Write a protein that binds this ligand. Sequence first.
Ligand SMILES: [Zn+2]
Ligand SMILES: [Zn+2]
Length: 56
Amino acid sequence: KAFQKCPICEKVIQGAGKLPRHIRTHTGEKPYECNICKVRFTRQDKLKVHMRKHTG
DNA sequence: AAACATCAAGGGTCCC
DNA sequence: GGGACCCTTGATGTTT
Ligand SMILES: [Zn+2]
Ligand SMILES: [Zn+2]
């Protein structure tokens, strides 16, 4: 596949568009927000699993 | 105080 | 590249 290097930590990350996920570990930015409980996450899949709690 | 289940953070991998 | 799911590890709560 393809790999990327972190500009901050120099750790090798395997991901095409997965670098921003590792970037949001140092700065802790949360662009995704829940519609109901307003809980914020740094990853789209993490927001999806939170939505799974609302609808059983 | 081991054994055990649960949740989440972080990374790998596939598929569209 | 974004969406989606899985694998590994550590903190926390149960239970006996
Ligand atoms: Zn980094
Ligand atoms: Zn919610």
